[PDB]
Amino acid sequence: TRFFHRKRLKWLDRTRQFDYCLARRVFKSKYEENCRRRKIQVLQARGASDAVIEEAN
């Protein structure tokens, strides 16, 4: 899957179809959102109040 993906990436790149900055932004946003949701759910698991949750994050 990695090899076929890389070949398709190269084809896309040569075709002027692939956007490096867009892919990087999507990647970073997804990773940061997953990290944020982990902490939010961990805090909610303890039964803290809405004010405590808002002040923590």
């Binding site: 899957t1 076929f4 993906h5 398709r8 990436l9 896309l12 075709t15 002027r16 179809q17 692939f18 956007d19 900055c21 867009l22 892919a23 932004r25 999507v26 990647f27 946003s29 997804k30 959102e33």
Partner: protein, 662 residues
């Protein structure tokens, strides 16, 4: 076959006649019988030599989003440009990265590139650009057999959004692979869903009888919508699917409910695919019991229609292959020498037809106009006039049914809605009329022919002519006008209006055919019977005979005159360019019948005018008409004393089967 293609290429007279773009249909295909295929199983062994060395979850290739029309930017600075991009463009630019609804919603509040029409924040974007519902479903390939029906039904509820093709293609493939695991009843529903997806929003041919669903108003002056992408010429279902699925039904035919059988026949019909094995098996199962009675009026019609539609073509094809079979056979020289020395419509089971007839008769009142018409027109196909063969009793039953239906018909209850729907209803009424006409002729001919050796139909028939005369007159005035052949810089011609115009003209031609046939039907009545029969045969074959008279109609003379006036009015203001090719001679014949003992109708009929326009069409289409039609016309024209320099040029210098003989 090489010699057969060369003959078609070298042929100077064979062409592809098409009055309208929508008239063309996919070619007919006859599927073979299933058999064990050990070789295919051995070949399958070579396709799985390295599966152990590959992905265990996604071994198959990855779908590719469709490409754009114009080339992308030089530097591919889509994010810096800030312009909105389509779902496929975003997919292809973000590395085919999934954009769940939360991520898409977060990104839309930060950049305008994601603020596109297809970028729904509440649905998300799929890997392959999927959106608007399809993005919320998993790959078809990954769905278990047990969850296929629900997935397809949910998806059905969902140059824009070009990514659905991938999903449907995947689904199609999946179905095929999992054919042998799904319920027999669920298979039919899956096929129907696929056909609905493949033929959503289409228009049926003008000359076609069978139709899946009934046209209704949709929430343009005419209200009709056309699209070359969804042209009827396009096959909904690949033959592969059908071929694969064929075997399944043979094994569990007894487990199919009548509603499922009707849907199966309709799907087959829609696909244009046929199977002898299946056809016969379905034919030999259902029968009348003193069970066809279980079928409802709506399903019965469809089941009949499909069967007939298929069978006709089946027979036709059989006939064609019969003759080609001759050359494949080898002949020895001794046989050659010996030869040298020496030279010195019935496509229905009787039982089935009887049952159908009885069914119709018994529940005439339970049928609707569309269903009734569809059913009737199908069954009338077998009844011919050359003279197993159906019985007088059987035909009488259908006649009675027709009569009953006519008597119980309300005569329009939708308050005259959309023009296309009204035209379709008029055509259905004409079909009904046609059927009615044919039944009487068959009965009469049979009786008259059999007698030599050793039901009040007209009363019900009379109303259809009046209704058609009124509706055609109303719709002619209500429809918009268009240019005539006979008489920015460009003539405005909307393709959407010629469709309804052709529908109206086809209904008129149908009625003209029916009224013509009625004459013969009546005339057959007791000159000797044999002589009478001979006369009718002459008339039908297009031979020298006695002049045709209208008085024989009797009670129907006034209705015939009104119909002639209606067609004259229509043709005087709408030309003759939308008339059917298969019913051209009838329109000529009806005017010859009207020309008799006349007082004032001589001047309106010339002898632009309707006659002239008809002639103009005849001349135009002379390259398409059959020898029967040509002879009929040749005689008809003579009868009326119609002199045309153009028509006479073609009637004696452009055919060999008529001009080169006497």
């Amino acid at each position: 076959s090489v010699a057969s293609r060369i003959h078609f290429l070298n042929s100077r007279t064979r062409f592809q006649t098409a009055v309208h773009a929508s008239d063309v249909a996919p070619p007919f295909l006859l599927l073979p019988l299933a058999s064990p295929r050990p070789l295919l199983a051995y070949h399958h062994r070579f396709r799985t030599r390295n599966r152990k060395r590959g992905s265990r979850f996604h071994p198959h290739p990855l779908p590719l989003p469709p490409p754009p029309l114009s080339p992308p930017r030089s530097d591919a600075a889509h994010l810096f440009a800030g312009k909105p991009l389509a779902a496929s463009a975003v997919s292809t630019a973000a590395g085919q990265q999934t954009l769940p609804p939360p991520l898409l919603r977060h990104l839309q509040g930060l950049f305008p590139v994601f603020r596109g029409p297809e970028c729904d924040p509440s649905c998300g974007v799929g890997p392959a650009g999927e959106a608007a519902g399809l993005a919320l479903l998993p790959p078809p390939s990954l769905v278990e057999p047990r969850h296929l029906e629900d997935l397809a039904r949910r998806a059905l509820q969902a140059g824009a959004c070009k990514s659905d093709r991938l999903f449907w293609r995947e689904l199609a493939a999946r179905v095929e692979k999992v054919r042998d695991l799904l319920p027999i009843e669920s298979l039919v529903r899956l096929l129907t869903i696929l056909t609905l997806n493949g033929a959503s929003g289409t228009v049926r041919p003008v000359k076609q009888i069978f139709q899946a669903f009934e046209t209704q108003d949709e929430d343009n002056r005419t209200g009709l919508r056309l699209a070359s992408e969804t042209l009827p010429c396009v096959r909904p279902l690949p033959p592969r699917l059908l071929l694969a699925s064929t075997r399944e039904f043979l094994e569990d035919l007894k487990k199919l409910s009548p509603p499922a059988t009707a849907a199966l026949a309709a799907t087959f019909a829609w696909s244009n695919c046929a199977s002898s094995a299946l056809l016969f098996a379905l034919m030999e199962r259902w029968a009348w019991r003193q069970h066809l009675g279980d079928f409802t009026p709506a399903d019965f019609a469809l089941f009949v229609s499909a069967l007939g539609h298929l069978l006709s073509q089946q027979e036709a094809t059989h006939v064609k292959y019969s003759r080609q079979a001759r050359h494949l056979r080898e002949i020895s020289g001794k046989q050659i020498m010996a030869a040298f020395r020496e030279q010195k419509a019935w496509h229905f089971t009787a039982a089935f037809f009887d049952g159908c007839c009885r069914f119709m008769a018994t529940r005439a009142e339970s049928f609707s106009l569309f269903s009734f018409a569809s059913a009737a027109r199908t069954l009338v196909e077998n009844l011919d006039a050359v003279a197993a063969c159906p019985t007088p009793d059987s035909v009488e039953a259908l006649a009675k049914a027709i009569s009953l239906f006519v008597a119980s018909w309300d005569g329009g209850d939708k308050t005259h809605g959309r023009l296309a729907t009204r035209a379709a209803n008029l055509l259905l009424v004409a079909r009904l009329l046609r059927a009615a006409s044919q039944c009487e002729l068959y009965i009469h001919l049979h009786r008259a022919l059999r007698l030599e050796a050793e039901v009040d139909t007209v009363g019900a028939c009379k109303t259809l002519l009046e209704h058609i005369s009124c509706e055609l007159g109303l719709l002619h005035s209500e429809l918009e006008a268009l240019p005539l052949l006979n008489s920015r810089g460009f003539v405005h011609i909307s393709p959407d209006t010629v469709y309804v115009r052709n529908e109206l003209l086809a209904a008129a031609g149908e009625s003209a055919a029916a009224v013509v046939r009625l004459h013969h039907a009546k005339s057959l009545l007791q000159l000797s019977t044999g002589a009478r029969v001979d006369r009718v045969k002459r008339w039908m074959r297009g031979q020298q005979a006695e002049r045709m008279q209208l008085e024989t109609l009797g009670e129907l003379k006034s209705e015939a005159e009104h119909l002639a006036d209606a067609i004259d009015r229509v043709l005087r203001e709408r030309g003759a360019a939308g008339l059917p090719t298969e019913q051209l001679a009838d329109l000529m014949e009806v005017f010859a019948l009207c020309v008799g003992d006349k007082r004032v109708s001589q001047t309106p009929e010339e002898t632009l005018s309707s006659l002239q326009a008809l002639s103009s069409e005849i001349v135009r289409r002379y390259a398409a008409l059959d020898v029967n039609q040509k002879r009929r016309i040749k005689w008809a024209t003579r009868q009326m004393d119609w002199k045309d320099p153009y028509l006479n040029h073609c009637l004696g210098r452009f055919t060999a089967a008529v001009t080169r003989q006497r």
